Amino acid sequence: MNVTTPEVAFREYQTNCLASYISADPDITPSNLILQGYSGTGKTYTLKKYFNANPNLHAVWLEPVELVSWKPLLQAIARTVQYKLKTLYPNIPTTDYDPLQVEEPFLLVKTLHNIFVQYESLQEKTCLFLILDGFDSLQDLDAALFNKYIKLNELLPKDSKINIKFIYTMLETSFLQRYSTHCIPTVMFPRYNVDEVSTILVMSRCGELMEDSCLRKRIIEEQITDCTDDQFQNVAANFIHLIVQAFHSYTGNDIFALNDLIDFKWPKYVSRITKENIFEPLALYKSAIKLFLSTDDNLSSQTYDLSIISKYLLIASYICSYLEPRYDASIFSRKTRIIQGRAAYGRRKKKEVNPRYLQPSLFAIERLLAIFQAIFPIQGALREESLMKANIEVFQNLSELHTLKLIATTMNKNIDYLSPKVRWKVNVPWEIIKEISESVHFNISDYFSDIH
Amino acid sequence: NLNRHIRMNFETFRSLPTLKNSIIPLVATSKNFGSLCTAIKSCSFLDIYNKNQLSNNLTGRLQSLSDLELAILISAARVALRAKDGSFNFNLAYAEYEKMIKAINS
Amino acid sequence: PVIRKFTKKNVARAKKKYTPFSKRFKSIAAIPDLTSLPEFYGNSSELMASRFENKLKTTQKHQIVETIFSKVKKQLNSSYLPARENEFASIYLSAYSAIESDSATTIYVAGTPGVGKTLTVREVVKELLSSSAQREIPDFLYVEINGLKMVKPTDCYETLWNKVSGERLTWAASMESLEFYFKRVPKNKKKTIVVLLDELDAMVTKSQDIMYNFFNWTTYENAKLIVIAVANTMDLPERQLGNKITSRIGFTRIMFTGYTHEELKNIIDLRLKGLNDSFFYVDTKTGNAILIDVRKVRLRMSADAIEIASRKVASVSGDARRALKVCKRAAEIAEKHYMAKHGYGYDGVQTVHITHVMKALNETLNSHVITFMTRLSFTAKLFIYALLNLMKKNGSQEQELGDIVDEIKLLIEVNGSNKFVMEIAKTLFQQGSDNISEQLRIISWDFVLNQLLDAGILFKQTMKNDRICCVKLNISVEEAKRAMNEDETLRNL
Ligand SMILES: Nc1ncnc2c1ncn2[C@@H]1O[C@H](COP(=O)(O)OP(=O)(O)OP(O)(O)=S)[C@@H](O)[C@H]1O
Ligand SMILES: Nc1ncnc2c1ncn2[C@@H]1O[C@H](COP(=O)(O)OP(=O)(O)OP(O)(O)=S)[C@@H](O)[C@H]1O
Ligand SMILES: [Mg+2]
Ligand SMILES: [Mg+2]
Q: How far is the CA of C256 from the centre of ligand 2 (A)?
A: 11
Across the interface, whether the CB atoms of C9 and A101 are under 8 A apart is answered yes
Nearest to C347 by CA among C76, C73, C67: C67
Closest CA–CA distance from residue A101 to any residue of chain C (Å): 5
Residues A252 and B67: their CA atoms lie apart, in Å, by 9
Rounded to a whole number of angstroms, the CA Rg of chain A reads: 33
CB C407 within 8 A of CB C389: yes
Interface membership of C436 toward B (CB under 8 Å): yes
Residues, chain C: 493
C76 neighbors C327 (Cβ within 8 angstroms)? yes
Q: Which helix (H) or strand (E) holds A131?
A: strand A126-133
Decide if B36 touches A, using CB distance below 8 A: no
Nearest to A73 by CA among A99, A96, A47: A99
CA separation, residue C404 to residues A43, C179, C372, C493 (Å): 35, 65, 21, 15
Residue C397 to residues A31, A203, A307, C326, C400: CA-CA distances in angstroms?
40, 57, 58, 38, 10
Rg (CA), chain C: 32
Say yes or no: A20 contacts chain B, CB-CB below 8 A. yes
From residue A436, how far is each of A311, A409, C2 by CA, in Å?
7, 21, 53
Using alpha carbons, select from A246, A148, A270 the residue that is nearest to residue A194.
Answer: A246
Measured between beta carbons, which residues in chain B are less than 8 angstroms from residue A29?
none
H or E element in which residue C459 lies: strand C458-460
* From B8, B13, B60, residue closest to C427, measured CB to CB: B8
Residue C10 sits at the vertex; the CA angle it makes with C5 and C16, to the nearest 5 degrees, is 110
What Å distances lie between residue A98 and A71, A75, A106, A111, C10, CA to CA? Answer: 14, 9, 15, 9, 11
Q: Is C146 helix (H, G, I), strand (E, B) or coil?
A: strand
DSSP C98: H
* CB-CB under 8 Å, A28 with B61: no
Q: Encode C165-176: b = buried (16+ Cβ within 10 Å), e = exposed.
A: bbbbbebebbbb
- What is the residue range of A59's domain? 12-178
CATH code for position A160: 3.40.50.300
CB A205 within 8 A of CB A240: yes
Q: Which of C216, C224, C277 is nearest to C250 (CA)?
A: C216
- Nearest residue on chain A to C446, judged by CA atoms? A177
User: What distance in Å separates the CA atoms of residue B66 and residue A332, rounded to the nearest whole number?
Assistant: 49
Residue type, C248: R
Inter-chain contacts counted by CB atoms under 8 A, chains B and C: 57
How far is it, in rounded angstroms, from Cα A426 to Cα A318? 6
The conformation of residue A279, written as its DSSP 8-state character, comes to T
Give the separation between CA B58 and CA C405, rounded to whole angstroms: 14
| CA C230 to ligand 4 centroid distance, Å | 9
Please give the sequence-ordered ranges of beta strands (E in DSSP) within A209-329, or none if there are none. none
CB-based burial label for A259 (10 Å; 0-12, 13-18, 19+) = middle
Distance from the Cα of residue A61 to its chain's centroid: 23
CA of B43 vs chain C CAs: smallest distance (Å): 12
Instruction: Identify from A1, A183, A195, A254 which residue to disrupt to test chain B contact, counting B C-beta atoms within 10 A and taking the largest count.
Output: A183
**Cβ separation A177–C446 shorter than 8 A:** yes
How much distance in Å is there from the Cα of A46 to the middle of ligand 1?
8
In what side-by-side order are the strands of the sheet with A126-133?
Answer: A58-62, A126-133, A162-169
How far apart are the C-alpha atoms of A173 and C453, rounded to whole Å?
A: 18
CA C78 – ligand 2 centroid, Å: 8
Q: Which residues of B sit within 8 Å Cβ distance of C?
A: 4-5, 8, 10-14, 47, 50-51, 54, 57-60, 63, 86
Contact B66 A248 (CB under 8 A): yes
**Long-range CB pairs of B84-93, under 8 A, 24+ apart, other chains included:** B86/C468, B89/A357, B91/A357, B92/A357
DSSP-derived pairing of the beta strands C471-473 and C458-460: antiparallel
- B71 and B97 Cβ atoms separated by less than 8 Å: yes
Burial-class residue C139 by CB neighbours within 10 Å (0-12, 13-18, 19+).
middle
What contacts A28, CB < 8 A, 6 or more positions away? A1, B28
Pocket test for ligand 2, best of C119, C146, C256 (most atoms within 8 A of CB): C119
Is the Cβ of C448 closer than 8 Å to some Cβ of chain B?
Answer: yes
Collapsing DSSP to helix, strand or coil, B42 comes out as helix
Q: Tell me: is residue C456 an annotated ligand-binding position.
A: no
Pocket flag, ligand 1, residue A160 (CB < 6 Å): no
d(CA A309, CA A140): 43
For ligand 1, say whether the CB of A199 is within 6 Å of any of its atoms: no
Q: How many residues does chain A have?
A: 452
**DSSP readout, A377-421?**
PP----S---S----HHHHHHHHHHHHTTSEEE---TT--SS-TT
Q: Contacts by B17-24 with C-beta closer than 8 Å and gap 24+?
A: B17/A183, B18/A183, B20/A183, B21/A183, B21/A185, B21/A186, B22/B46, B22/B49, B22/B50, B24/A20, B24/A21, B24/A185
Classify strands A162-169 and A407-409 as parallel, antiparallel or unpaired: unpaired
Q: DSSP of A324-348, one letter per residue?
A: -TTTTTTTT--SPPSS--------S
Using CA atoms, how far apart are residues C236 and A273, in angstroms rounded to an integer?
Answer: 92
Q: Are A66 and A29 in contact (CB under 8 A)?
A: no
- Tell me the ligand closest to C144's alpha carbon: 4
Do C437 and B57 make contact, defined as CB atoms within 8 angstroms?
A: no
- CA-proximal residue: ligand 2, atom 2 (nearest): C116
Chain C residues with CB under 8 Å of B10 CB are 377
Q: How many CB atoms lie within 10 A of CB C261?
A: 17
Experimental technique behind these coordinates: cryo-EM
Minimum-distance ligand to the CA of C78?
2
Spatial CA neighbour of A134 closest among A49, A204, A58, A68: A68
Tell me how crowded residue C243 is: count the other CB atoms within 10 A of its CB.
9
Provide the strand spans (E) within C201-316.
225-227, 254-255, 280-283, 294-297, 299-301
Q: How far is A32 from chain C (nearest CA, A)?
A: 18
Q: How far apart are the first and last CA of chain B?
A: 53
A252 annotated as a binding-site residue: no
Q: Which helix (H) or strand (E) holds C474?
A: none
Q: How far is CA B18 from CA B24, B54, C153, C377, in A?
A: 10, 14, 48, 14
- Is A207 marked within a binding site? no
Q: Which residues of B touch C439 (CB under 8 A)?
A: 54, 57-59
Is there a binding annotation on residue C119? yes
| CB-CB neighbours of C419 under 10 Å | 7
Q: Whose CA is nearest to atom 30 of ligand 1?
A: A45
Cα of A244 to nearest chain C Cα, Å: 27
Q: What separation in angstroms does the CA of C468 have from each of A176, C150, C398?
A: 19, 45, 11
Q: Whose CA is nearest to atom 31 of ligand 1?
A: A204
Burial of C203 (C-beta count, 10 Å sphere; 0-12/13-18/19+): buried
Nearest Cβ partner for A357 among B25, B67, B95: B95
Question: Which residues in chain B have their CB less than 8 angstroms from residue C428's CB?
Answer: 11-12
Minimum Cα–Cα distance from B11: chain C residue: C378
Resolution of the solved structure (Å): 3.6
**Ligand 2 proximal residues by C-beta, below 6 Å:** C 78, 81, 83-84, 113-119, 199, 230, 267, 320-321, 324
Report whether C106 contacts C229 (CB < 8 A).
yes
The values of phi and psi at residue C239, to 5°, are -95, -55
Spatial separation of the C-alpha atoms in residues A318 and A436, rounded to whole Å: 11
Provide the 10 A C-beta neighbour count for residue A323: 21
Residue type, A364: A
Q: Which ligand is nearest to the CA of A203?
A: 1
d(CA A400, CA A357): 26
Task: Provide φ and ψ at A169, rounded to 5°.
Answer: -155, 105
CB atoms B25 and A252 under 8 Å:
no
Nearest to A7 by CA among A230, A203, A234, A209: A203
CA-based radius of gyration for chain B:
22
- CA-nearest residue to C462 within chain A is A143
Residue C283's beta-bridge partner residues?
A: C294
What is the spatial distance between Cα A232 and Cα C201, in angstroms, rounded to a whole number?
Answer: 84
Residue C309's φ and ψ, nearest 5 degrees, are -75, -25
| Cross-chain Cβ contact C443/B4 below 8 Å | no
Dist. CA C176–CA C22, nearest whole Å: 8
Q: Label the pairing between strands C294-297 and C280-283.
A: antiparallel
Q: What 8-state DSSP symbol labels residue A357?
A: G
Distance of CA A268 to CAs A157, A216, A255, A289, Å?
61, 14, 21, 11
Q: Is A399 in the pocket of ligand 1 (CB under 6 A)?
A: no
